[PDB]
């Protein structure tokens, strides 16, 4: 990884000696029954992650943006349910949280939900961002349920004029996907298959035994996904219901588009970071439906989004190691005690 410099400085006597780390894999498949404990691991592995995920920098002044926002937003225009789309604030934070939170989730192979807020449509738009990237694969089926349908209904379908029959899901095939078979606007149509099919490519065996459910070059930094997620948006501007509606909605959409030049940057960021950090994980990691969630307020999400500039941050060297080191030890302990354990038990029998 070019960006990182390597060099040697001290020599080594033929006296040099170390002790094998011993990093055998799982040995114990807890992935298929000990839910209670996985939840506890995930949690752990998760916090661990946040501790690492670099804090962001150079953001757009909270005030400035929200202000051009009101100009664009046309907030108080009849609609009764005001001041629910602006509890968005504390973004200088929300983004940092939303950011960290997102990674660990992934790394730690955790699964979560969404402090969702139906009315606040914007908050939804951004949702579409989320699925555009984060492999829904690791999102309890349900929180995805709400999210999509909320999009699907209070959006697309009617403002796009299509199914004015708003919609009705059960529990098998997903509202984000099936919608496809029934849509005629290619742009719209690609989003659908890509989003419904982007399964966190649960298949990897790197640097010697490190199943770390990976992610699309596409996404990675081919990004386009974003460019396409936008282009599809670029032609959703039309009739059906009251005026203060399309006006408000589309205007918000545009804020995603313009910013899109930058939204790109986001994709790259994560792409790297996850793709980097990960490298130093010994523990394998099978995708599992944790028993516990993790609340992610579209609030923050939305912030991160239109609120990131030409910032650029990455894992401090020292940081990275520290990470390796930990998992390492831990592993060593697990494996070791295992041996210590077994040994006894077997003896215990004869």
């Amino acid at each position: 990884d070019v960006n990182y410099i390597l060099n040697m400085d001290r020599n080594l006597p033929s006296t040099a000696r170390y002790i094998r780390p011993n990093l055998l894999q799982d040995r114990l498949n807890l992935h298929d029954n000990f839910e209670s404990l996985w939840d506890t691991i995930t949690t752990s592995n998760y916090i661990l992650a946040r501790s690492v995920v670099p804090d962001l920098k150079e953001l757009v002044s909270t005030e400035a943006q929200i202000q051009k926002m009101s100009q664009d937003l046309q907030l108080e225009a009849l609609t009764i349910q005001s001041e629910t789309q602006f509890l968005t604030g504390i973004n200088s934070q929300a983004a940092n949280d939303c950011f960290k939170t997102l990674i660990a989730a992934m790394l730690s192979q955790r699964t979560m939900s969404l402090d969702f807020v139906t009315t606040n449509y914007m908050s939804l738009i951004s949702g579409m961002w989320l699925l555009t990237v984060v492999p829904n694969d690791m999102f309890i089926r349900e929180s995805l349920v709400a999210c999509q349908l909320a999009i699907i209904n209070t959006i697309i379908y009617p403002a796009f004029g299509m199914q004015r029959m708003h919609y009705r899901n059960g529990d098998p095939q997903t509202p984000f996907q099936i919608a496809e078979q029934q849509i005629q606007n290619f742009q719209v149509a690609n989003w659908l298959h890509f989003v419904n099919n982007n399964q966190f490519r649960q298949v990897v065996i790197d640097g010697v035994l490190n199943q770390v459910l990976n992610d699309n070059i596409r996404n990675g930094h081919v990004v386009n996904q974003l460019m396409e997620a936008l282009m599809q948006l670029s032609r959703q501007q039309f009739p059906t219901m009251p005026v203060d509606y399309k006006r408000s909605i589309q205007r918000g959409i545009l804020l995603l588009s313009n910013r899109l030049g930058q939204l790109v940057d986001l994709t790259r960021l994560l792409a790297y970071n996850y793709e980097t950090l990960m490298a130093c994980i010994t523990m394998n990691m099978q995708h599992v439906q944790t028993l516990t969630t993790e609340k992610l307020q579209l609030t923050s999400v939305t912030s991160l989004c239109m609120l990131i500039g030409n910032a650029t941050v990455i894992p401090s060297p020292q940081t990275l190691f520290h990470y390796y080191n930990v998992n390492v030890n831990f592993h060593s302990n697990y494996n070791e005690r295992i041996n210590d354990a077994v040994a006894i038990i077997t003896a215990a029998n004869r």
Binding site: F186, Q187, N190, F194, R218, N224, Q225, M227, E228, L230, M231
Partner: peptide, 9 residues
Amino acid sequence: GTTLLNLDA
């Protein structure tokens, strides 16, 4: 173009 993730007709 430049933003297309699948070409349309």
